[PDB]
From TrEMBL, chain C:
Assembly mode: V-ATPase is a heteromultimeric enzyme made up of two complexes: the ATP-hydrolytic V1 complex and the proton translocation V0 complex.
Lineage: Eukaryota, Viridiplantae, Streptophyta, Embryophyta, Tracheophyta
Family: Belongs to the V-ATPase G subunit family.
Annotated coiled-coil segments of the chain: 17-47
Domain of life of the organism encoding this protein: Eukaryota
Transmembrane stretches, start-end: none
Function in brief: Catalytic subunit of the peripheral V1 complex of vacuolar ATPase (V-ATPase). V-ATPase is responsible for acidifying a variety of intracellular compartments in eukaryotic cells. Subunit of the V1 complex of vacuolar(H+)-ATPase (V-ATPase), a multisubunit enzyme composed of a peripheral complex (V1) that hydrolyzes ATP and a membrane integral complex (V0) that translocates protons. V-ATPase is responsible for acidifying and maintaining the pH of intracellular compartments and in some cell types, is targeted to the plasma membrane, where it is responsible for acidifying the extracellular environment.
Protein name as it appears in the record: V-type proton ATPase subunit G
Automatic annotation (TrEMBL), chain E:
Protein name: V-type proton ATPase subunit a
Subcellular localization: Membrane
Coiled-coil positions: 45-70
Family: Belongs to the V-ATPase 116 kDa subunit family.
Domain of life per record: Eukaryota
Shown chain mapped onto the complete sequence: 50 to 146 of 823
Native source species: Citrus clementina (Clementine)
Primary role: Essential component of the vacuolar proton pump (V-ATPase), a multimeric enzyme that catalyzes the translocation of protons across the membranes. Required for assembly and activity of the V-ATPase.
């Protein structure tokens, strides 16, 4: 213990911060970007269909 | 005669390379010895997934164990990892030879 | 001691699960958001 | 972060008399009192003060503290205020009020940017906390990094503050575009993963998150295509054994893997290396396994495209020759020769001429190995090589230097002598 | 010296016995190369390079033996035709 247990608990806390937060926020950001981009593409396709309908009208 | 000459040239080139190859293998004797020792030590040991650090329990000279900090510090500095392993001694009934 | 490491592992697992749930929720919300945006664009086209 | 906490403690440990400064007209008496209250908001909430509970009063104290841009004074004020606001009892809704009110954001601008490095680091938490043009303005070619880093290090002395600011900018797509406009993004790419540092893991992880964010953005994707030493950063990350940083870099590379024939070939070079690293070094993260599978798929896709180049003799056309995977395969080498043989071995004739005289020593060895493989696969290849007389030059190179090229030339000579021998 | 807790739990794949098997394959290749060098008499990533060099030397030796056999066959034909 003493300095050893302090080093161990500091390592655990640093793991919780860095390893957990980095993967979590990276996954969140990447998933949000991919999902919103894909659904924006879907909305663009729907807008193209609506534009075709408006052109027919 | 042409085939024999070509074979002789090929064998000569093979031996010329094989001299340095043998020297490299001579070094590779110690290299493979160290690699196999490390592999066997890892296989014997059981890592701790929760701490993300391999768990090691061995029979070491308790008086000389004080110097283990030097090797631990050398490994930490060479690896440059901020995370530092902790070495401890656990009392038990089993008598280390 | 070791229980602190166990709690650390539990917290990391909770963070990972939260990240997965957040990704799923972000996708689900973005679907409706972009649908509404497309509807608004269609409204301007109608105008 | 540990560095931010240490910098905040280095500022909070030292005291500054607000009353003396107010008497000396350095700050307003009410302003100095509000700065002291922002500093001691932890004790104020411990005492259940009305100002601490009141988000607006805490916001007023925060604005008064942020108004000053002095190094030590604003450093202590911002660090202690951020530490107190982190605690729930002190400045809980004050953060939301500050985010809502543009006045609080404007006040932190003075304490940030042009100010002491310790002050900048202390106010960096609130500045990065979104919950504008000035924030976009705060990014430039030099920006606040020149003060945050070892240059003008001051009490904080942490480049990690600049790294966190870069990550925060990468978080916002508008801030991402603003930083793309600012210079030094490509230079930062060469040093994304610190090769050897105490904070190397933190810096590498932050830069990997920034790289993933850049991969998310198309304009940032173009900037990365124009970035410098991005492949060098990828190779450094491959050298690094930091499994968390390795997984982050793998995710960033996967998100940034475009078609991009050149970058795809470069990745395929690393993709076998990535698979080898995954096999040799087991990674705890399943995301690492998924990225390894994606990298293997990308390597296969690149090999599919490279096969057409090998058949069409792209290396021969460009003038630079490398050991072709199709050349190493007798069937693929025979198919490539037949594609050349479609023009009466015209591409094969060019390959033989390059074997006789090549731009680079690696090109000559690659040509000799390809010629040996084709001669083994096709008898016509040996005849063409003998006619071009490149076989004698290769045999001479076998006794020459470049022992690897010497072995390849010996293999070519053996392939020729197999037909030559009765 | 650590006890073999993982081996006792499972010899198959143990904890890093995949790496142990890879090292065993590397050591087998090294032993084959050392045997070849001892036969040759030489003074005696990296493992892959050593295996490639040993394979190249073995291939060169086999090609030389095949060429010697072909030379013997041609000498037989030449002697028979000269006698005729």
């Amino acid at each position: 213990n003493d300095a050893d247990v302090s080093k161990q608990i500091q390592q655990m806390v640093r793991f919780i911060r860095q390893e957990a937060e980095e993967k979590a926020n990276e996954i969140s950001v990447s998933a949000e970007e991919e999902f919103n981009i894909e659904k924006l593409q879907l909305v663009e396709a729907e807008k193209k269909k609506i534009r075709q309908e408006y052109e027919r009208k | 005669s042409e085939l024999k000459t070509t074979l002789d040239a090929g064998l000569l080139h093979r031996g010329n390379l094989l001299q340095t190859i043998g020297d490299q293998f001579e070094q590779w004797n110690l290299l493979v010895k160290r690699e196999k020792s490390i592999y066997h030590t890892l296989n014997m040991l059981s890592l701790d997934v929760t701490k993300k650090c391999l768990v090691g329990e061995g029979w070491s000279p308790v008086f000389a164990t004080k110097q283990i900090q030097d090797a631990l510090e050398r490994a930490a500095f060479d690896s440059n990892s901020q995370v530092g392993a902790i070495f401890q001694v656990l009392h038990t009934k089993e008598s280390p030879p | 001691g070791i229980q602190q490491l166990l709690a650390a592992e539990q917290e990391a697992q909770h963070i990972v699960a939260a990240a997965r749930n957040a990704k799923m929720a972000r996708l689900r919300q973005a679907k409706e958001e972009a649908e509404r945006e497309i509807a608004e664009h269609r409204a301007q086209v109608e105008r | 972060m540990d560095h931010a906490e240490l910098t905040t403690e280095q500022v909070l440990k030292r005291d500054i008399p607000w009353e003396t400064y107010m008497t000396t007209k350095l700050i307003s008496g009410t302003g100095l009192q509000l700065l002291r209250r922002y500093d001691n908001r932890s004790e104020s909430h411990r005492a259940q003060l009305l100002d601490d509970d009141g988000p607006s009063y805490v916001r007023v104290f925060v604005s008064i503290l942020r108004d000053i841009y002095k190094e030590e004074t604003v450093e202590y004020v911002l660090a202690l205020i951020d530490e107190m606001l982190t605690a729930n009892p002190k400045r809980a809704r004050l953060f939301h009020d500050k985010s809502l009110a543009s006045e609080d954001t404007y006040e932190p601008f003075l304490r940030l940017l042009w100010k002491g490095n310790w002050f900048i680091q202390e106010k960096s938490c609130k500045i990065l906390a979104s919950i504008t043009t000035i924030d976009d303005v705060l990014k430039l070619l030099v920006e606040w990094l020149c003060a945050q880093l070892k240059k003008p290090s001051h009490p904080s002395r942490g480049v990690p503050v600049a790294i966190n600011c870069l990550a925060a900018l990468l978080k916002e797509p508008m801030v991402r575009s603003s930083f793309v406009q600012a210079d030094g993004v490509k230079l930062l790419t060469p040093l994304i993963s610190p090769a050897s540092t105490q904070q190397s893991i933190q810096l590498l992880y932050e830069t990997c998150l920034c790289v993933w964010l850049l991969s998310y953005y198309e304009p940032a994707v173009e900037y990365l295509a124009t970035t410098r030493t991005l492949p060098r950063l990828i190779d450094v990350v491959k050298s690094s054994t930091k499994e968390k940083v390795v997984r982050v870099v793998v995710l960033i590379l996967r998100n940034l893997l475009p078609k991009g024939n050149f970058a795809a070939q470069m990745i395929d070079l690393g993709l076998p290396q990535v698979v080898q690293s995954l096999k040799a070094q087991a990674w705890s993260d399943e995301d690492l396994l998924e990225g390894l599978n994606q990298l293997e798929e990308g390597l296969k896709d690149n090999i599919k495209r490279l096969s057409s180049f090998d058949k069409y003799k792209q290396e021969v056309l460009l003038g630079h020759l490398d050991w072709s995977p199709m050349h190493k395969d007798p069937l693929f080498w025979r198919d490539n020769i037949t594609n050349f043989e479609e023009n009466d071995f015209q591409i094969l004739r060019v390959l033989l001429t390059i074997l006789d005289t090549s731009s680079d020593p690696r090109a000559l060895a690659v040509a000799c190995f390809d010629l040996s493989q084709f001669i083994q696969y096709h008898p016509a290849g040996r005849v063409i090589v003998t006619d071009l007389k490149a076989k004698e030059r290769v045999m001479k190179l076998m006794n020459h230097e470049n022992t690897e090229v010497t072995k390849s030339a010996l293999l070519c000579i053996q392939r020729l002598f197999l037909g030559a021998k009765y | 010296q650590f006890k073999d807790l993982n081996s006792e739990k499972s010899p198959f794949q143990r904890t890093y016995a995949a790496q142990i098997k890879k090292c065993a394959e590397m050591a087998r290749k090294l032993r084959f190369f050392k045997e070849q060098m001892l036969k040759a008499g030489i003074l005696s990533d990296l493992e892959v390079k050593l295996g490639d060099l040993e394979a190249e030397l073995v291939e060169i030796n086999a090609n030389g033996d095949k060429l010697q056999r072909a030379h013997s066959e041609l000498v037989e034909y030449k002697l028979v035709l000269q006698k005729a």
